[PDB]
Design a protein around this ligand. Structure first.
Ligand code: A1AQB
Ligand code: ZN
Ligand code: ZN
Length: 582
């Protein structure tokens, strides 16, 4: 309690001594409340005019148009302490999993240089505004790095002064850049050195890319076993227990010297004890604390979510196989059986999973998994939209399974080669591309964001008739040489000025380990679509009058956007499609 957080709290009080007050009408039950002070402030979604002018049929589709308009009663909840048998299963599995992840990797500190190049290339690091304007400016200024040193030496001393969360089923906890640096220094290696790559972690998909996920699910399908299970957790981040935070901290056991002390401090002082500042309109700043739940940087969060999810799912698999009888208490022979299971088949059981943070797909040994619920419920990883003790409903076809907001189709090319392609409801794809984040976008910057969406569609969703046509139209409407941009940046092979047919060949043929025949594709017409009926099932407007007028008159929409942007060098990509090829 207050010895670890007091200094952070004491320091905040003094900068707002002309406001402090212990309010007695504070809404917090599960968050420890400390005091309040005076403020007054709020970022809504803006429409991308280049994308919207080139997708006119969707102007009358509510699922698209509503996306551009616009629970914290889940953050103020508590999770019970697991039983002793559950805690033992988790500690033993966590110990074994950090060992496996560490067999071919070396933990190491990330550097001011690595951090500097990150901010100078626009990764969403979740910092705040204040003494410097942007993150770009603070990084080129030794004043900052002296503040970072003060905090750093404080951490080595086992104390914290300035590592405070700012709160804003989504809730994102910004820290000042300096705090983000010390987190990145201690734990950035997990992401930077690909600890959750498939090659290293066997369940993981970190860095795989949306063009590999479908092939990965198909490889899991090839295993002998039961249905494929894809149970979502109800508010994963709010269900992370202090016991989970302590099993995650065991990664420091693989570390040494300075690194071990810096990493232990981030875990102790910022994760297992948190200080948070929240806005309350009643507008005061509430300074609140708690020990449990997830509040890290979004990238360390991804890695620790993958870790703890892998652990939970192996334990659920153990329960389905009857490795242990009861979560109440693990016998001594049951611990030995859990350890022997992990040594004998642990790696085979990891390869039956695809896990991305809180998202998973498991192909267990058989369907006893469906009703193995006691450990999963007692760890607090309660399934979304199903009664606590109702058995999971599995999928019989890998092309039906949901994963990372997608499903995957098997698509046979005119030459017999097999593509496994990602897909989702087309209203979701068009609706997202019509949205921009932030203020002060020039027309040029708005056009270059539209071009990023268009190139993503050409690479990933080429098999959707409407998206190949709209992607070609947007690339025709934006100057040929203008570089695709994004303000928050899986692999992103569409972020290039190289010709998209050449990128398609590299991604889908040359570098695709599931394609034996490396014969390049010579034109877009060699690259197939979904069946017309499947395309309509996944949201295509093919067959509608509005869509036929749009397609036929597309050069008029292209010329409207060219006229707005002005006298520039443009390319006509529309003859890359059969129907416009004369
Ligand atoms: C663009 C281009 N597309 N084509 C093309 C592609 C496939 C078949 C046919 N007949 C033509 C070109 O010759 C140039
Ligand atoms: Zn600190
Ligand atoms: Zn689909």
């Amino acid at each position: 309690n207050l010895d670890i957080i007091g200094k952070r709290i004491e320091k905040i009080k003094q900068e707002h001594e002309t406001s402090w007050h212990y309010d007695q009408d504070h809404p917090y039950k599960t968050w420890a409340y400390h005091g309040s002070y005076e403020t007054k402030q709020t970022a809504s979604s803006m429409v991308n005019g280049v994308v919207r002018l080139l997708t006119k049929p969707w102007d009358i589709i509510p699922m698209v148009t509503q996306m551009a308009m616009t629970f914290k009663e889940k953050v103020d909840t508590r999770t019970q302490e697991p039983k002793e048998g559950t805690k033992k299963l988790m500690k033993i599995t966590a110990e074994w999993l950090w060992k496996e992840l560490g067999k071919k990797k070396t933990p190491r500190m990330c550097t001011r240089e690595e951090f500097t190049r990150k901010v100078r290339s626009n990764a969403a690091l979740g910092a705040i505004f204040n003494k410097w304007k942007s993150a770009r400016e603070a990084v080129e200024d030794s004043g900052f790095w002296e503040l970072v040193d003060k905090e750093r030496n404080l951490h080595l001393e086992g104390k914290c002064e300035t590592c405070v969360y700012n709160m804003m089923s989504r809730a994102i906890w910004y820290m000042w850049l300096g705090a983000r640096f010390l987190e990145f220094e201690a734990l950035g290696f997990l992401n930077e050195d690909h600890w959750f790559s498939r090659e290293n972690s066997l369940s993981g998909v970190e860095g795989e890319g949306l063009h590999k996920l479908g092939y990965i699910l198909r490889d899991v399908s090839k295993k002998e076993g039961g249905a494929m299970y894809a149970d979502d957790t109800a508010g994963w981040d709010t269900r992370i227990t202090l016991e989970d935070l302590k099993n995650e901290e065991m990664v420091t056991n693989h570390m040494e010297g300075e690194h071990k002390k810096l990493a232990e401090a981030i875990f102790k002082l910022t994760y297992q004890n948190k200080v948070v500042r929240v806005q309350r309109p009643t507008t005061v700043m509430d300074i609140i604390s708690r020990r449990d739940q997830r509040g890290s940087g979004q990238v360390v969060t991804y890695g620790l979510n993958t870790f703890t999810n892998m652990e939970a799912q192996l334990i659920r698999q153990m329960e389905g196989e009857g490795v242990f009888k009861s979560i109440q208490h693990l016998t001594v022979t049951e611990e030995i059986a859990v350890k022997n299971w992990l040594v004998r088949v642990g790696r085979e059981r990891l390869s039956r999973m695809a896990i991305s943070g809180d998202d998973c797909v498991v192909k267990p040994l058989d369907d006893r998994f469906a009703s193995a619920l006691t450990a999963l419920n007692d760890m607090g990883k309660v399934r979304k939209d199903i009664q606590q003790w109702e058995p999971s409903r599995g999928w019989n076809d890998w092309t039906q399974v949901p994963f990372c907001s997608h499903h995957f189709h098997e698509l046979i090319m005119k030459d017999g080669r097999v593509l496994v392609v990602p897909c989702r409801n087309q209203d979701e794809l068009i609706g997202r591309a019509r949205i921009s984040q932030g203020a002060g976008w020039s027309l040029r910057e708005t056009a270059c964001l539209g071009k990023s969406y268009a190139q993503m569609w050409s690479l990933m969703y080429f098999h959707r008739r409407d998206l190949r046509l709209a992607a070609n139209a947007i690339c025709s409407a934006v100057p040929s040489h203008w570089v695709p941009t994004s303000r928050t940046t899986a692999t992103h092979e569409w972020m290039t000025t190289e010709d998209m047919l050449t990128v398609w060949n590299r991604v889908w043929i040359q570098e695709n380990p599931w394609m034996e025949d490396k014969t390049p594709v010579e034109s877009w017409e060699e690259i197939p679509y979904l069946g017309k009926r499947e395309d309509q099932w996944c949201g295509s407007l093919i067959g509608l009058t509005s869509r036929a007028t749009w397609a036929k008159n597309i050069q008029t929409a292209i010329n409207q956007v060219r006229s707005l942007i002005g006298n520039e060098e443009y390319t006509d990509y529309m003859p890359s499609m059969k129907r416009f090829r004369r």
